[PDB]
Design an enzyme around this catalytic site. Structure first.
Site, PDB file in Angstrom:
ATOM      1  N   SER A  62       0.772  -1.242   0.000  1.00 57.74           N
ATOM      2  CA  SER A  62       0.000   0.000   0.000  1.00 57.74           C
ATOM      3  C   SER A  62       0.807   1.299   0.000  1.00 57.74           C
ATOM      4  O   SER A  62       0.208   2.340  -0.172  1.00 57.74           O
ATOM      5  CB  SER A  62      -0.977   0.017   1.149  1.00 57.74           C
ATOM      6  OG  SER A  62      -1.901  -1.065   1.023  1.00 57.74           O
ATOM      7  N   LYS A  65      -0.112   3.313  -2.910  1.00 50.91           N
ATOM      8  CA  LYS A  65      -1.204   4.294  -2.896  1.00 50.91           C
ATOM      9  C   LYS A  65      -0.680   5.726  -3.014  1.00 50.91           C
ATOM     10  O   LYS A  65      -1.412   6.604  -3.504  1.00 50.91           O
ATOM     11  CB  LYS A  65      -2.103   4.111  -1.659  1.00 50.91           C
ATOM     12  CG  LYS A  65      -2.882   2.781  -1.702  1.00 50.91           C
ATOM     13  CD  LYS A  65      -3.634   2.534  -0.400  1.00 50.91           C
ATOM     14  CE  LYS A  65      -4.547   1.328  -0.435  1.00 50.91           C
ATOM     15  NZ  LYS A  65      -3.814   0.039  -0.611  1.00 50.91           N
ATOM     16  N   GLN A 118     -10.951  -5.150   0.830  1.00 44.86           N
ATOM     17  CA  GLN A 118     -10.551  -5.838  -0.396  1.00 44.86           C
ATOM     18  C   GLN A 118     -11.752  -6.074  -1.276  1.00 44.86           C
ATOM     19  O   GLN A 118     -12.873  -6.178  -0.781  1.00 44.86           O
ATOM     20  CB  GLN A 118      -9.940  -7.226  -0.060  1.00 44.86           C
ATOM     21  CG  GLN A 118      -8.690  -7.151   0.797  1.00 44.86           C
ATOM     22  CD  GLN A 118      -8.191  -8.530   1.143  1.00 44.86           C
ATOM     23  OE1 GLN A 118      -8.690  -9.200   2.060  1.00 44.86           O
ATOM     24  NE2 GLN A 118      -7.181  -8.977   0.406  1.00 44.86           N
ATOM     25  N   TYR A 149     -10.769   2.070   5.415  1.00 44.95           N
ATOM     26  CA  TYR A 149      -9.601   1.828   4.544  1.00 44.95           C
ATOM     27  C   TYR A 149      -9.945   0.763   3.494  1.00 44.95           C
ATOM     28  O   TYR A 149     -10.460  -0.306   3.814  1.00 44.95           O
ATOM     29  CB  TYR A 149      -8.418   1.455   5.398  1.00 44.95           C
ATOM     30  CG  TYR A 149      -7.133   1.264   4.632  1.00 44.95           C
ATOM     31  CD1 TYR A 149      -6.396   2.359   4.174  1.00 44.95           C
ATOM     32  CD2 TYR A 149      -6.613  -0.008   4.423  1.00 44.95           C
ATOM     33  CE1 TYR A 149      -5.171   2.183   3.523  1.00 44.95           C
ATOM     34  CE2 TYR A 149      -5.380  -0.192   3.796  1.00 44.95           C
ATOM     35  CZ  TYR A 149      -4.668   0.908   3.356  1.00 44.95           C
ATOM     36  OH  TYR A 149      -3.434   0.752   2.767  1.00 44.95           O
ATOM     37  N   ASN A 151      -9.024  -0.895  -0.619  1.00 45.80           N
ATOM     38  CA  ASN A 151      -8.387  -1.097  -1.915  1.00 45.80           C
ATOM     39  C   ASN A 151      -9.360  -0.798  -3.071  1.00 45.80           C
ATOM     40  O   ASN A 151      -8.974  -0.059  -3.989  1.00 45.80           O
ATOM     41  CB  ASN A 151      -7.737  -2.472  -2.000  1.00 45.80           C
ATOM     42  CG  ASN A 151      -6.538  -2.501  -1.092  1.00 45.80           C
ATOM     43  OD1 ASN A 151      -5.522  -1.913  -1.386  1.00 45.80           O
ATOM     44  ND2 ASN A 151      -6.674  -3.090   0.083  1.00 45.80           N
ATOM     45  N   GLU A 271      -0.660   9.851   5.008  1.00 46.06           N
ATOM     46  CA  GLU A 271      -1.340  10.038   6.304  1.00 46.06           C
ATOM     47  C   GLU A 271      -0.379  10.822   7.193  1.00 46.06           C
ATOM     48  O   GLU A 271       0.826  10.487   7.250  1.00 46.06           O
ATOM     49  CB  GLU A 271      -1.668   8.691   6.917  1.00 46.06           C
ATOM     50  CG  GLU A 271      -2.699   7.955   6.069  1.00 46.06           C
ATOM     51  CD  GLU A 271      -2.962   6.522   6.483  1.00 46.06           C
ATOM     52  OE1 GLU A 271      -2.765   6.221   7.690  1.00 46.06           O
ATOM     53  OE2 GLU A 271      -3.491   5.743   5.659  1.00 46.06           O
ATOM     54  N   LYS A 314       3.369   6.252   5.379  1.00 45.31           N
ATOM     55  CA  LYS A 314       2.484   5.217   4.847  1.00 45.31           C
ATOM     56  C   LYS A 314       3.106   3.860   5.119  1.00 45.31           C
ATOM     57  O   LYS A 314       4.293   3.624   4.829  1.00 45.31           O
ATOM     58  CB  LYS A 314       2.216   5.380   3.321  1.00 45.31           C
ATOM     59  CG  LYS A 314       1.128   4.439   2.800  1.00 45.31           C
ATOM     60  CD  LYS A 314      -0.285   4.810   3.283  1.00 45.31           C
ATOM     61  CE  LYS A 314      -1.333   3.774   2.870  1.00 45.31           C
ATOM     62  NZ  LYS A 314      -1.271   2.541   3.713  1.00 45.31           N
ATOM     63  N   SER A 317       1.967  -3.442   2.941  1.00 41.35           N
ATOM     64  CA  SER A 317       2.219  -4.864   3.141  1.00 41.35           C
ATOM     65  C   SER A 317       1.653  -5.680   2.019  1.00 41.35           C
ATOM     66  O   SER A 317       0.609  -5.338   1.434  1.00 41.35           O
ATOM     67  CB  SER A 317       1.536  -5.367   4.420  1.00 41.35           C
ATOM     68  OG  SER A 317       1.871  -4.552   5.527  1.00 41.35           O
ATOM     69  N   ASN A 342       6.099  -9.787   6.189  1.00 41.34           N
ATOM     70  CA  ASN A 342       5.030  -8.928   6.640  1.00 41.34           C
ATOM     71  C   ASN A 342       5.008  -9.004   8.173  1.00 41.34           C
ATOM     72  O   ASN A 342       4.353  -9.883   8.768  1.00 41.34           O
ATOM     73  CB  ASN A 342       3.704  -9.346   6.015  1.00 41.34           C
ATOM     74  CG  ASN A 342       2.522  -8.527   6.481  1.00 41.34           C
ATOM     75  OD1 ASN A 342       2.637  -7.626   7.316  1.00 41.34           O
ATOM     76  ND2 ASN A 342       1.369  -8.715   5.833  1.00 41.34           N
TER      77      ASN A 342
HETATM   78  B1  LIG Z   1      -1.755  -2.164   2.084  1.00 37.57           B
HETATM   79  O1  LIG Z   1      -0.525  -2.737   1.889  1.00 37.57           O
HETATM   80  O2  LIG Z   1      -2.057  -1.502   3.281  1.00 37.57           O
HETATM   81  C1  LIG Z   1      -2.586  -2.471   4.212  1.00 37.57           C
HETATM   82  C2  LIG Z   1      -1.477  -3.112   5.043  1.00 37.57           C
HETATM   83  C3  LIG Z   1      -0.579  -2.103   5.738  1.00 37.57           C
HETATM   84  O3  LIG Z   1       0.636  -2.286   5.689  1.00 37.57           O
HETATM   85  O4  LIG Z   1      -1.111  -1.087   6.301  1.00 37.57           O
HETATM   86  C4  LIG Z   1      -3.323  -3.430   3.299  1.00 37.57           C
HETATM   87  C5  LIG Z   1      -2.943  -3.170   1.975  1.00 37.57           C
HETATM   88  C6  LIG Z   1      -3.440  -4.060   1.005  1.00 37.57           C
HETATM   89  C7  LIG Z   1      -4.286  -5.105   1.369  1.00 37.57           C
HETATM   90  O5  LIG Z   1      -4.805  -5.946   0.352  1.00 37.57           O
HETATM   91  C8  LIG Z   1      -3.923  -6.774  -0.275  1.00 37.57           C
HETATM   92  N1  LIG Z   1      -4.321  -7.657  -1.193  1.00 37.57           N
HETATM   93  C9  LIG Z   1      -3.241  -8.330  -1.629  1.00 37.57           C
HETATM   94  N2  LIG Z   1      -3.385  -9.296  -2.537  1.00 37.57           N
HETATM   95  N3  LIG Z   1      -2.030  -8.003  -1.150  1.00 37.57           N
HETATM   96  S1  LIG Z   1      -2.184  -6.798  -0.030  1.00 37.57           S
HETATM   97  C10 LIG Z   1      -4.690  -5.321   2.686  1.00 37.57           C
HETATM   98  C11 LIG Z   1      -5.593  -6.480   3.045  1.00 37.57           C
HETATM   99  C12 LIG Z   1      -4.204  -4.457   3.683  1.00 37.57           C
HETATM  100  C13 LIG Z   1      -4.591  -4.654   5.132  1.00 37.57           C
END
Ligand SMILES: *[B@@]1([O])O[C]([C]C([O])=O)C2=C1[C]=C(OC1=NC([N])=NS1)C([C])=C2[C]
Length: 360
Positions: A62, A65, A118, A149, A151, A271, A314, A317, A342
């Site tokens: 993320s 983003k 998701q 939050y 995606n 953020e 930011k 993961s 992770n």
């Molecule tokens: B993203 O990386 O931000 C959060 C995790 C964090 O580090 O804050 C997050 C992001 C993506 C994500 O959905 C994903 N789907 C796949 N296939 N890889 S990551 C999720 C579930 C989260 C919590």
């Protein structure tokens, strides 16, 4: 000498966290007073013994983003979209859907009305399935009221920003955004010639994990980059004025706060927090409830500049990787921490806080 003291500070922050979280490999990059410093630890691959370097590619999840937000900032500077546009303005397939009443700003900042964390497992990486998911979606609550939050939310924001520019998202990122930012080791789709740099990700019983395809993966979590390139991106964020003017404006658009949730001010991608702030509060802003639960927002009367005495950050993961980026605009300080496990966000923030406190 200063090099000895800086190494001691970074090693003291990193080494116990790598041992405690069984992290095979971790790369730190720091920007201090306009100078870069790199600290590389462990293995990119346990099986072949390849060591981490500042050129190793990691999945940043993320943190992608913030790149998505930068592309949208470019579309905004070009007047191809406005944050107040209805989302369906940019995609006729959405005409008449609930996206007729949702703004691009709501999508960007996770306030469209309950778009989930998701995409459901039933929505594959397929243009028609993604289209049909959005066409049928209905909000759980009023847009602009609660942050959840998501995606699919910022994913649609990036997808629509790309449509406003008349080109696919991935192509715009490769052909225009990464070159404008001077990033040659940053990828959505790693070239075969760069695969030797791609670290292995590790899960349970060291299961190997590299991110697989998913709907709007590029927009939400798909970047792979090195610590050196991600620090170049941080330095661009610290000094947008050094870039060509439309790209300076695109970065500046990601440094505007729209609302607060607790100690956190939400921008486009980034953020922000007041700085100084306690480690416990920075960890709480980056906690599991922040990623998983809805929170009522406190909207700002006008967008606020995210600069001065603030920390912009930011987390990112994937199944196999854990990244964190933070910078302090008013102190010309930047930090990147990339790992191939992770491991908990609280632990990432713990390393970062020790380093940033010691650089100060
Ligand atoms: B993203 O990386 O931000 C959060 C995790 C964090 O580090 O804050 C997050 C992001 C993506 C994500 O959905 C994903 N789907 C796949 N296939 N890889 S990551 C999720 C579930 C989260 C919590």
């Amino acid at each position: 000498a200063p090099a000895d003291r800086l190494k001691a500070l970074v090693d003291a922050a990193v080494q116990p966290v790598m041992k405690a979280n069984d992290i095979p490999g971790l790369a730190v990059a720091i920007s201090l007073k306009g100078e870069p410093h790199y600290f590389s630890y462990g293995l990119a691959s346990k099986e072949d013994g390849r060591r981490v370097t500042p050129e190793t590619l990691f999945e940043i999840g993320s943190v992608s983003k913030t790149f998505t937000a930068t592309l949208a900032g470019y579309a905004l500077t070009q007047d191809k979209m406005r944050l107040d546009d209805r989302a369906s303005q940019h995609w006729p397939a959405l005409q008449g859907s609930r996206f007729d009443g949702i703004s691009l700003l709501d999508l960007a900042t996770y306030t469209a009305g309950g778009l989930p964390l998701q995409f459901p497992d039933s929505v594959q990486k397929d243009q028609a399935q993604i289209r049909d998911y959005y066409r049928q979606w209905q909000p759980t609550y009023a847009p602009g009221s609660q942050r959840l939050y998501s995606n699919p939310s910022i994913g649609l924001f990036g997808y629509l920003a790309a449509r406003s520019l008349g080109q696919p998202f991935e192509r715009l990122m490769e052909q225009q955004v990464f070159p404008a930012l001077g990033l040659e080791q940053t990828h959505l789709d790693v070239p075969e010639a760069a695969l030797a740099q791609y670290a292995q990700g590790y899960g349970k019983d060291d299961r190997p994990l590299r991110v697989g395809p998913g709907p709007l993966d590029a927009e939400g979590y798909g970047v792979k980059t090195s610590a050196a390139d991600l620090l170049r991106f941080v330095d661009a964020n610290l000094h947008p004025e050094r870039l060509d003017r439309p790209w300076a404006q695109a970065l500046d658009a990601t440094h505007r706060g729209y609302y607060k949730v607790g100690d956190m001010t939400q921008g486009l991608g980034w953020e922000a927090y007041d700085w100084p702030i306690s480690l416990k509060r920075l960890q709480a802003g980056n906690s599991t409830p922040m990623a998983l639960q809805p929170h009522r927002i406190a909207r700002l009367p006008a967008p606020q500049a995210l600069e001065g005495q603030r920390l912009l950050n930011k987390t990112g993961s994937t199944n196999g990787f854990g990244a964190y980026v933070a910078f302090v605009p008013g102190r010309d300080l930047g930090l990147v921490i990339l790992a191939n496990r992770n491991y908990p966000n609280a632990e990432r923030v713990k390393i970062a806080y020790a380093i940033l406190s010691g650089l100060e």
